[PDB]
Amino acid sequence: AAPTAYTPLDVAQAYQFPEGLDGQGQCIAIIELGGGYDETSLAQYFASLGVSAPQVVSVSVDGATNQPTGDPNGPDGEVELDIEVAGALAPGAKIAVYFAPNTDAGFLNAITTAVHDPTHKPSIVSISWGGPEDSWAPASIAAMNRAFLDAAALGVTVLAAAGDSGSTDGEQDGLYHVDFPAASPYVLACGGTRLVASAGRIERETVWNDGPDGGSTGGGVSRIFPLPSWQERANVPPSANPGAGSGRGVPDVAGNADPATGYEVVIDGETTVIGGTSAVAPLFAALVARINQKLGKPVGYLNPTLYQLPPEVFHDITEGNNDIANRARIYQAGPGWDPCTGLGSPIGIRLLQALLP
């Protein structure tokens, strides 16, 4: 019950990230709609972990720029968490941070700008911003989903945090909701767990659920995207919302997100702990950068492949639920894919081995 924290290297070790690979030759794009980062925090942090610091550059979209507010509890926490987690684990990769206005067009423009960027040429895009899929204008959902389909066609992996307010995703309208962009079938949706691990083993990994006050992983069944062909054997349940419905199941994978077993980071000069699914997209972006480095070619769109890989590639989470609204336990983890943690946490070395011919 005592709160703990890990450096990103400890979590990568627990998930058996492949050794001897650092993302050299890869560029990870990170999307930001507010805040900024300062070089002092990044340099202190990377030095503290003993890793050669990755090059980090900012890209302005629609007039937005890298502008830290200086408040460790503000958006700088998101920006610096993203860079510190991805950068500490794929320090050989180049990191390009795209800043855009916090509008639907700005979010879309940041994604399309990164995906098609001929200067930075990212092979991976990490996204830790989002909102309930049914709170978005339908036109915006369509445009962003098409941008993600385009990234898949181009061989660019797009990862997105699944949410921090459980199965209701922050809405109090008597229904369950999944977050977008995680709900897009073209995005690798990243859920969250409470991880108890040491260098040699995972002692326990359960659904992240700290109640209404502490947050919980997003997850559920989309009301907008049909169940994908490649997800039809995952046993995604019907939606818990009356009238139910078959839909794309969220998330696809999951990793440590509980702030109570969180990430030690340096935000605006302050050493602290941050969690949330915001950390999981950059964590797995670094894993993908390592895998791409070894393969010599980008894995791009991974979802169809992940769902047909052998079970041994994942650590199945089976205990917990992501309900923070009521006592119904919607949804619950269980054997195999579930709407709290998807396929579970990847075992890095096994995922790499499964992707090599």
* Residues lying near a second copy in the complex (CB under 8 A): 1-7, 9-10, 48-50, 104-105, 112, 133-134, 137-143, 146, 149-150, 185, 196-201, 203, 223-226, 228-229, 243, 262, 264-265, 271-273
Task: Write down the least CB distance from residue 342 to Ca ion, Å.
Answer: 8
**Chosen from a second copy, Ca ion, none, partner binding at 9 (C-beta under 5 to 8 Å by type):** a second copy
Contact yes or no for 235/224 (Cβ under 8 A): no
Catalytic residue among 22, 32, 38, 78: 78
**Chosen from a second copy, Ca ion, none, partner binding at 140 (C-beta under 5 to 8 Å by type):** a second copy
Helix (H) or strand (E) holding 138: helix 138-153
Task: Write down the least CB distance from residue 210 to Ca ion, Å.
Answer: 19
Asked whether position 316 contacts Ca ion by CB under 5 A, the answer is: yes
Q: How far apart are CA 197 and CA 200, in angstroms?
A: 8
Contact yes or no for 191/340 (Cβ under 8 A): yes
| 94 or 223: CB nearest a second copy | 223
Asked whether position 338 contacts Ca ion by CB under 5 A, the answer is: yes
Q: How far apart are CA 247 and CA 315, in angstroms?
A: 24
Asked whether position 104 contacts Ca ion by CB under 5 A, the answer is: no
Q: How far apart are CA 167 and CA 325, in angstroms?
A: 8
Q: How many residues bind Ca ion (CB under 5 A)?
A: 3
Stretch that binds Ca ion, among 60-68, 292-300, 323-331, 333-341 (CB under 5 A): 333-341
| 170 or 354: CB nearest a second copy | 170
Q: Between 39-48 and 76-89, two packed helices, what is the crossing angle to 10 degrees?
A: 40
Q: Is 84 a catalytic residue?
A: no
Most distant CA pair in the chain: distance in Å? 54
Stretch that binds Ca ion, among 51-59, 268-276, 294-302, 334-342 (CB under 5 A): 334-342
Which residue is associated with the tokens 């050669």? 52
**Preceding amide of 251 cis, omega within 30:** yes
Q: In the Cβ-directed half-sphere of 99, how many Cα atoms lie within 13 Å?
A: 20
**Chosen from a second copy, Ca ion, none, partner binding at 354 (C-beta under 5 to 8 Å by type):** none
| 77 or 334: CB nearest a second copy | 77
Task: Write down the least CB distance from residue 190 to Ca ion, Å.
Answer: 15
Q: Please tell me whether residue 267 adopts helix, strand or coil conformation.
A: strand
| 97 or 265: CB nearest a second copy | 265
Closest by CA position to 158, among listed 118, 112, 126, 190:
126
Q: Is 278 a catalytic residue?
A: yes
Q: Is 78 a catalytic residue?
A: yes
Closest by CA position to 31, among listed 122, 118, 93, 119:
122
Q: Please tell me whether residue 254 adopts helix, strand or coil conformation.
A: strand
| 115 or 325: CB nearest a second copy | 115
Task: Write down the least CB distance from residue 231 to a second copy, Å.
Answer: 11
Catalytic residue among 82, 205, 264, 338: 82
Chain center to CA of 158 = 9
Catalytic residue among 84, 278, 323, 338: 278
Q: Please tell me whether residue 106 adopts helix, strand or coil conformation.
A: helix
| 42 or 351: CB nearest a second copy | 42
**Chosen from a second copy, Ca ion, none, partner binding at 316 (C-beta under 5 to 8 Å by type):** Ca ion
Q: Residues 6 or more apart from 25 whose CB is under 8 A from it?
A: 92, 93, 292, 293
Stretch that binds Ca ion, among 70-78, 91-99, 236-244, 308-316 (CB under 5 A): 308-316
Find the angle CA(289)-CA(103)-CA(183) to the nearest 5 degrees: 50
> Active-site residue numbers?
78, 82, 278
Residues at the contact surface with Ca ion, assessed by CB under 5 A: 316-317, 338
